[PDB]
């Protein structure tokens with residue numbers, strides 16, 4: 001019971017499952033309603049789950065209840081006393097950030113995009129300081145609310161190679177510093193409205209390019225300071241990367257002195273259009 005110390009136990013009569021929207025480790029994820037009524041996402045642990053699955057499922061519920069931060073998905077509660085067991089979270093209206101960006105190409109101001117990134121960074125700083133290494137930080141794992149607030153989540157699946165730091169790929173060293181690398185990729189995803197990192201390079205081509213010193217080029221219309229910051233997230237030497245504390249501080253200062261974002265990094269045009277004279 002102590003694992004659930006930060007969670008609220010929800011009675012099953014409060015929950016209505018409506019539509020399957022995903023899979024858990026041993027069960028489905030549903031959109032549903034929770035009693036006023038509010039929409040929720042509901043992850044179940046169905047009959048037949050193993051001991052390890054139960055420990056991991058209740059452990060997930062417990063840590064999610066512990067997290068209380070504006071930029072982390074909110075746990076409404078847990079059903080642990082009845083079967084199927086359930087983890088119940090808020091339901092974001094705008095869905096996942098990657099799809100959202102791609103469906104809203106060019107619709108936001110630079111300040112709005114940078115504000116998104118500040119929120120993601122604040123959530124990640126909180127996770128890191130709570131001793132939680134995400135390991136799968138990517139725009140697909142971030143939800144967006146109707147105030148444009150980004151909420152770090154984890155929707156499950158092995159290694160998303162092109163979001164993952166070299167040391168995590170090479171020797172399985174996952175830390176908050178490998179999450180910083182991933183955050184740099186997320187910065188690039190946001191500023192490009194959901195372009196796929198490294199385009200059609202294979203996983204092996206990405207790893208070879210990184211090891212040889214190549215890095216993603218600047219997004220179009222990207223503030224110089226923002227490109228500089230994402231580039232420092234991609235230092236090979238893990239110790240040279242900013243901490244999330246540094247990232248949050250820098251993004252907050254840029255937003256609060258917004259003229260700092262008017263200077264743009266040079267975009268390298270991959271195609272040349274010459275209007276004849």
Ligand SMILES: Cc1ccc(C(=O)Nc2cccc(C(F)(F)F)c2)cc1Nc1nc(-c2cccnc2)nc2nn(C)cc12
Pocket residue numbers: 021022023024029041042043060064067072073087088089090091092093094095096127132134143152153154155156
């Ligand atoms: C039910 C549920 C359970 C666990 C999680 C989840 O984010 N877990 C988790 C685990 C470890 C660490 C973290 C965290 F640190 F926050 F990133 C989060 C999310 C959810 N909520 C979900 N919401 C949604 C969703 C979809 C559209 C709009 N709003 C929510 N989709 C989900 N798919 N899956 C597999 C889970 C979804």
